[model samples]
Target chain A: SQLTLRALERGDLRFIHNLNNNRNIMSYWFQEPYESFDQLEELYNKHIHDNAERRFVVEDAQKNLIGLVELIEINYIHRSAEFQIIIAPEHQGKGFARTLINRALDYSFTILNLHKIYLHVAVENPKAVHLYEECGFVEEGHLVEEFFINGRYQDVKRMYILQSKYLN
Target chain B: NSQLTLRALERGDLRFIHNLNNNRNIMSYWFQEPYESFDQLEELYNKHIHDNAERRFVVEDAQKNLIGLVELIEINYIHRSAEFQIIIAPEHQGKGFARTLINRALDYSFTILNLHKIYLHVAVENPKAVHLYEECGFVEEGHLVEEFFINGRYQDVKRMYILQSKYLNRE
Candidate 1:
């Protein structure tokens, strides 16, 4: 209710391109940095335009892009999906992430009719873990040495929130 | 700068903690009601001190005087996180004792315990305490309305947290 999530369009390519190339922001999660603007544009064209998964561009009342919220890996058999959220570094800690994630979860459980939604987070990223827990995600499992970044191994934590168990 | 040392809660310290807890102004924001008697105080201290998940410490000054109490509760080892609460004696208020105790507890949480994050909830109305938390590198993460019923009225709880990376980067 506090924020709006819209379908990704051609204009969103610039925002996605910026996020992919921002090595300082993606350094912890992504392994290799985008080589050039064309590389970023190609990646964005594939994920933002052609991907069947529901990807939305999070925007404020002024319609300025602030972040991203999406539900991917939709499994019809299991009635579940995985969620991904990334808030722009400059716009973080302003409640935009929470608002966007909440809306995305609502859509996943109600409109998409998914039974469960889960996410994998880097254990080193405590801020993201905190937000996930606050959003009612329960720790499901821990994958030790699952991610390699910056010439070192790191653990990845898996968390989930059941649609029936989630609260507003 | 100030340093905080932790000591076991002695018999005399119980009385001091009791007195500090009975102070309406200090205990108003805290979740628990004021201690009814010495026995109640003892029960509270024992439960908090002996529990594996809870680390209760009596904050002492350079002269080893009991000036405050700091406790780490709701510890989740799997999550690598915990919540901390601190209360200083009325006389010691406004003297930067809280900052010392917080920094000390943070050291224990991050370095000794290898925790990834430390979080706490404070009454939104307590501006002084909120300011103290902010000064200690804790950022306000969220606000919950009517989450705590205190003093016959519902109060807002402001959630704040400090990441281990942020703490280590500072020093």
Candidate 2:
């Protein structure tokens, strides 16, 4: 019942494929649910081959893939990164997400010593917004109509936690 | 003959632009390494700057000496927004040269380019630089904490922008 993380592997194809296709998990997602495994395969392949740091697999006790967390658009000289994550539906609410996120923050500040990490969350997701606030992240800016969703330009918030703010 | 004016960048302008491109006083504020080529400025002017002058403009004195440069660059075509920067020559500093160019530069982006939002990033070390843009109507959007390791130390950065609707209403 413990949580862990590791690089995504080829053995994860079916599980990762299934995770991406879950409807409830992607309810407010920007990308359409994967209709084919090949599309998901290409993404996994690309990340594995060229940009492994852009994505990671969340693993459970015994190394079962449970979810994902990532820091995309990573910039070192600037000491900043973009945060993104998704917990598989069955694994949601099981406290897996927060561990993934906490570990991510640890890596960001301790290993990378990044000063800032930022992200966008759909305007509709108040529950997750609350989750972020509890984790010491704050809503810094809101786009009146920011993202292209079911319609064009949906509202979202840019949230961040500074190394100074988070460390203390 | 050194009256402040704007013009398309010329080949002769490239050397000074390169000097500006690599100058420590100027480069510290901008996120770029020392440039290796001057030819790109020529190609950039003929291809993009000439047709879309509001995107970039060369600042010259009446004597036709390259004194500074300003522009709203990396324009997001769909977003109708851009990030801008301006650097005045060392000898040209403290003369309000940047002030004059910003007014005209913003005017062009909003009126001629038809952009909705124009934004810029400033390192926290430069209070005067931020003040110039803020006074000219840009507002602080966000403070990126410890964002860059410029020169030798960690530097915070600020994002600021001016909206066309607001600028047009001011006049």
Candidate 3:
């Protein structure tokens, strides 16, 4: 693997702050990137013991930060979870995004024993949507005006991949 | 319509809620396990009594007999959206009580709560329910694959939603 997926550490908060505050990235994530450093730190600290969430950072062979990957709202009974990823602006086009996602999927299905993994991607971001499709996630529905972002209502495509489909 | 009333759910309603909560067929459609005891129901009622993010109500007839339940949960003030769900007692089915229950719940969600959007999930196998919500102005948003594990197997679910503007515009 060209990148290493590892647990997020306190020192990585600075990187997270930069990424979280990035307008372009947060806009796609359907969130306002206005969280202060203290607020992010508080969430990180609180979420450390939270069983329903898993946060990780992608690092290059040289230990350079590549991106952030999160598996959130993991429902054990339903064997499902939501996936999110953000590759730093400078690291774009290096082909690290797919590898990062595949590793995350491995962790979710192989280790976590999750049966289904899903995500909501803004329909406007066709690049990311296309990437997710190539990685085996199929579009389940076209949600109409699902989120209000960047001063306009945005459409999101709900997508999912079953363990049976992914493992095969 | 004039004979039905929607009122806040209370501790006294636990036994009623508990009854339907244990019905396998009903809970299957609700996409939840079917065996919550009275103690569990009471515990949850006490825990969320002060939670502003949830609004639970019981539909009652003129005689004050509980006929249905309505839950508007995950209220997000910033997003102005919440999930809507309802369950009618077995004996109350097909008596046109669902329409009234849904109407009052939407009114409470859009007018009283002033939310911008309301959404719900129904089993895709349930054409009657799909027709019911579609009749109520909820548009189909998406189809989720194997979204719920009910009746010892996975089932697909259809997500439907309505905007406040659209609900208000409907005749």
Candidate 4:
């Protein structure tokens, strides 16, 4: 209720570029951050038109773009998808993530009729992991030494939540 | 004993992989039942051989008898990782051939492919799959709750992984 999500706008690419390229945020991501606004724009355009994923830009009450929330790998037959979010660094600790997470769940379970939602979070990011659990996600599996980061093994945890039980 | 060998699956493996793939007893421990058709299976193998796909290998024992098939799917050179899975014919289930197959697969994955990691999901109800992968140096990472349903029952899955460094150290 505190934040509203709408279709990502081309104008918001600048904000995305900043948050997405932040080293602290990109550390948990699978690949490097967007190198430029053009790169981020390409992916944002692709996501807006692609059926494989649904992307939304999070906005504050003032209508400022504050974050990105996406449901990727949407499989209709399987009724499942992967969720990801990146919030503005300045917006941290203001409870903006809770608003985004709840709204995404609403869209996934109620509108999309998805049966399950899941994600992978780096074990090193305990704060984000805590937020996911606070939003009703549960740790389902752990990936051991799943990534090679800074010449060292980095682990990830797979988290998922079922729709029926969650909605209840 | 170095008596086993692995090579690409041939079209003749149709009936062999079919029976192996469709058998409920064999598939009870799978991520999901093999709902794919025979043509689909062939196309899958076709991709493996011709498309640099998952790299499925037919496992043969010393007597040149096909005992099973093992695969390294979703090979990611950038992530330096992939998923490992296998199916052994019912007749060859109990003779400890799984260890041999996994070892050979790791050789191809780590030595030849130079992958950094290989992981898999196994049904916790499986008899000795966890033990097999564990003995082969795979570390159990976590357990999934009701990942899927099989044989009219909900099943839990265990995530297991082995790194090139860990595997090398074990050897």
Candidate with the greatest TM-score versus the true structure: 3
Report the candidate with higher lDDT, 1 versus 3. Answer: 3
lDDT of 3 by residue, B51-128 (tens): 677778888898888788898876767667889989888888888888888989999898888998899999999989
lDDT of 2 by residue, B1-171 (tens): 236787755556666766776665332221221224566555544554344323446887767777788866656555577778787878888887777888877888889878777777798888888997888998876676566678777777887778778888641
Query: What is the fnat score of candidate 2?
Result: 0.36
* Candidate 4: Cα lDDT at B14: 71
**Residue B139 Cα positional deviation in candidate 1, in Å, after optimal superposition:** 1.1
Which digits, one per residue and each the tens of the lDDT, describe model 4 over residues B87-129? 8888888888888888999988998999999989898998488
* Reference-based TM-score, model 4: 0.79
What TM-score does chain A of each model score against the native chain A?
A: 0.81, 0.79, 0.91, 0.85
Top candidate by lDDT: 3
Residue A94 alpha-carbon offset, candidate 4, angstroms: 3.0
Candidate 4 docking class: medium
Worst 10 residues of 2 chain B by lDDT: B26-35
Model 4 chain A poorest ten-residue lDDT run: A24-33
Candidate order by TM-score, decreasing, is 3, 4, 2, 1
Preferred candidate (TM-score higher): 3 or 4? 3
Interface RMSD of each: 12.7, 3.0, 1.0, 2.1
- In candidate 4, which residue pairs clash? none
User: Comparing candidate 3 with candidate 4, which one achieves the higher lDDT?
Assistant: 3
Which of candidates 1 and 3 is the stronger one according to DockQ? 3
